Amino acid sequence: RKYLNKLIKRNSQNLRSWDLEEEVRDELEDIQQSILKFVKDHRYPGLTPGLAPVGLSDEEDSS
């Protein structure tokens, strides 16, 4: 009884390992669907450091 249940659990774990995936699941989902179907300038990389932190209160206030 309980031994049979334990064997069931063990072999189920075996099959699950054979067919396992955690996030490759969604990744391969997107890939299979496709198969079956910020700011950045290109010429100055120096801009990504050069830019400033836009700040909502910093526009809103009339100080």
Binding site: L51, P53, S63
Partner: protein, 247 residues
């Protein structure tokens, strides 16, 4: 305790010594366990403050350098009543090279306190401005987006200007501070003015800055220190090093 005690000591030494009175800025120098792999350009890299503002555009004169034509830029900026009182002077690069050389150039250097230009002109800027500006980080030319609009390959760009966006940039900049990457363990940043604020504000600013620099996030901008940070020294322009966070 060491921090604010050394702060009091350096203050009193400033008001006693003649020249230490004359230099007017607090600087902190971080020595890191590892060097930085970022070769020194002059791109002004800025760091945000979560708590306390430092300088105000209302308090500071300012220079803007446009692209070449500059007609619509200048007239729009001076007209939209959000910058007419804000930008002290506006000049194009060619006109600047036509107007200032040598003596008059360093005359400018003495006059203005903070300058900025278009991010499509920043890299050209040095030779027309001079190594004389290009020392330290006091009058290091900044870099502001001017259009809030982007370029695409094989697509002509269109040029605009909006006071809301540009004024946001300026206010953000004077609210927070900046730095410049090096290739060794020693990087320096100005932190606060000697009377605009207080020791608790100093310590808050220091803690926020160190947290930003050590933060794993914002790696393109903030996650730049390599290895375990060694220590932080404090000074003014001519004082001596004072130690903080030795390990």
């Amino acid at each position: 305790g060491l921090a604010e005690k050394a702060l009091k000591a350096l203050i009193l030494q400033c008001e006693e010594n003649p020249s230490l009175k004359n230099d007017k800025d607090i600087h902190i120098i971080i020595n890191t366990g590892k060097k930085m792999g970022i070769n020194r350009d002059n791109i002004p890299r800025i760091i945000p403050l979560t708590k306390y503002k430092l300088f105000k555009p209302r308090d500071l004169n300012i220079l803007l350098i446009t692209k070449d034509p500059s007609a619509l830029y200048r007239e729009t900026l001076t007209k939209d009543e959000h910058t007419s009182e804000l930008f002290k002077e506006i000049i194009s690069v060619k006109n600047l090279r036509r107007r200032f050389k040598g003596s008059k150039l360093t005359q400018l250097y003495k006059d203005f306190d903070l300058v900025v230009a278009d991010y499509r002109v920043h890299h050209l800027l040095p030779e027309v401005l001079g190594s004389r500006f290009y020392h330290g980080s006091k009058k290091l030319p900044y870099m502001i987006r001017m259009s809030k609009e982007v370029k695409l390959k094989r697509q002509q760009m269109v040029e605009k200007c909006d006071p809301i966006y540009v004024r946001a940039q300026l206010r953000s900049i004077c609210k927070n501070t900046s730095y410049i990457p090096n290739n060794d363990n020693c990087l320096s940043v100005r932190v606060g003015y000697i009377q605009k604020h207080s020791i608790p504000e100093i310590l808050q600013n220091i803690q926020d800055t160190i947290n930003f620099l050590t933060d794993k996030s914002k790696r393109p901008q903030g996650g730049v220190i390599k290895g375990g940070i060694i220590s932080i020294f404090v000074k003014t322009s001519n004082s001596t090093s004072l130690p903080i966070y030795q390990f």
